[PDB]
Design a protein around this ligand. Structure first.
Ligand SMILES: *[C@@H]1O[C@H](CO)[C@@H](O[C@@H]2O[C@H](CO)[C@@H](O)[C@H](O)[C@H]2NC(C)=O)[C@H](O)[C@H]1NC(C)=O
Ligand SMILES: *[C@@H]1O[C@H](CO)[C@@H](O)[C@H](O)[C@H]1NC(C)=O
Ligand SMILES: *[C@@H]1O[C@H](CO)[C@@H](O)[C@H](O)[C@H]1NC(C)=O
Lengths: 13, 191, 179
């Protein structure tokens, strides 16, 4: 089975 | 190289209690070592940890898509990944190798330490006890503590501060999840 | 709790170093070799049971780079304070002459995640047989790292793990010899 990554959220410029 | 450095870290954490019955997810962001903003599944929204994180908490919380993506992570990320890896992580059991040998605090002394070296085990939780003639010795016990080897094994040395006498039987006893009963190693001065 | 799984990432300027790894209860499950775009399982057996699309990690690191730029500005360019490492050398098993063993150099409690580590045998650098881990996360958000040297214990050889870090005034040498 495949491990899933959690995305990192882009911050406010 | 004396140029200033700047570090960003992210830790996406899944905390499991009683298998996957209770799961907590944290989405954590750091500048150097300072956590500045975090999503805690116990709350369900981002919260600024320091003033540095306020703009992110405010903007991210305004986006329902971000919030629902994070709110579902306990299931789609944590529980999913636990299922993928549990057989070789959660279920990993490697039994310790146990060695007992005498030692000396200073090189020209007669033996005044007994060392129980417990090596190669997984997971980390372990209990090591010393006995003299079947009675537990609690005085003069000192240890390295639990040492992680970095390769999915641990070790620990547990010393008993005593001078071995002929006729005495010393036993190091080890309890560990990989074992179904205590592992014992006996040592005698005239063995 | 009972278990913790962490996907830990970092990006460091001006080095332009990024790392992506998974941790289970303090041990590394895998990391991504960002240059080769390959998943590197900590134990070979792990990869027979699970997979991870390495390509995916590059996107996260790119976001972390962008976020670092944002946070650097928010902080008015406040740089990281160097925290020098604690270094320990141990063997993985009780030492017996002429019985193969492994020296472990444990580099702990440091930041930023940049180090130069050299094994020395009788004062000379060793590269044969050596291995190392990537930078591993600590709960206090500093780092740790392991280096390894398989060896045949002898009365004739002495060893040192030499560690260089910007937080140190000079390289730290931790010694090991038989007895
Ligand atoms: C580790 O050693 C290297 C080599 O000294 C240092 O990195 C730089 O290496 C480049 C070439 O690859 C040189 O141009 C630089 O002069 C080196 N840095 C310096 C001394 O200015 C690096 O600093 C060392 N890392 C440490 C000590 O953490
Ligand atoms: C732990 O798991 C068992 C089996 O599902 C269950 O009976 C028990 O109530 C659980 N404990 C909690 C509080 O999660
Ligand atoms: C950066 O400087 C500005 C202007 O003084 C200030 O408003 C802000 O709080 C500073 N950020 C800090 C102290 O991290």
């Amino acid at each position: 089975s495949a491990v899933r990554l959690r995305s990192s959220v882009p911050g406010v410029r | 190289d004396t140029r200033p450095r700047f570090l960003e870290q992210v830790k996406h954490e899944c905390h499991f209690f009683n298998g996957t019955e209770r799961v907590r997810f944290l989405d954590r962001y750091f500048y150097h070592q300072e956590e500045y903003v975090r999503f805690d599944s116990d709350v369900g929204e981002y919260r600024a940890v320091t003033e540095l994180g306020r703009p992110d908490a405010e903007y991210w919380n305004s986006q329902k898509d971000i919030l629902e993506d994070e709110r579902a992570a306990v299931d789609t990320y944590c529980r999913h990944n636990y299922g993928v890896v549990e057989s070789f992580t959660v279920q990993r059991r490697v039994y310790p190798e146990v060695t007992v040998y005498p030692a000396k605090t200073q090189p020209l002394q007669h033996h005044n330490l007994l060392v129980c070296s417990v090596n190669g085990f997984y997971p980390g939780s372990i209990e090591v006890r010393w006995f003299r003639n079947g009675q537990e010795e609690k005085t003069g016990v000192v240890s390295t503590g639990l040492i992680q080897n970095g390769d999915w094994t641990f070790q620990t040395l547990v010393m008993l501060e005593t001078v071995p006498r002929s006729g005495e039987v010393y036993t190091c006893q080890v309890e560990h999840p990989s074992l179904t009963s205590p592992l014992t190693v006996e040592w005698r001065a005239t063995g | 709790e009972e278990h913790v799984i962490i996907q830990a990432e970092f990006y460091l300027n001006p080095d332009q170093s990024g790392e992506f790894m998974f941790d289970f209860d303090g041990d590394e499950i895998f990391h991504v070799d960002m240059a080769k775009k390959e998943t590197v399982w900590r134990l070979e057996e792990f990869g027979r049971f699970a997979s991870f699309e390495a390509q995916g990690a590059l996107a996260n690191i790119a976001v972390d780079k962008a976020n670092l730029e944002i946070m650097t500005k928010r902080s008015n360019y406040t740089p990281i304070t160097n925290v020098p490492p604690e270094v320990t050398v141990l063997t993985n098993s009780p030492v017996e002459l002429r019985e193969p063993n492994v020296l472990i150099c444990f580099i702990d409690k440091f930041t930023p995640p940049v180090v130069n580590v050299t094994w020395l045998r009788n004062g000379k650098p060793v590269t044969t047989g050596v291995s190392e881990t990537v930078f591993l996360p600590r709960e206090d958000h500093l780092f740790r790292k392991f280096h390894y040297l398989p060896f045949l214990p002898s009365t004739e050889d002495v060893y040192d793990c030499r560690v260089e870090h910007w937080g140190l005034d000079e390289p730290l040498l931790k010694h090991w010899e038989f007895d």
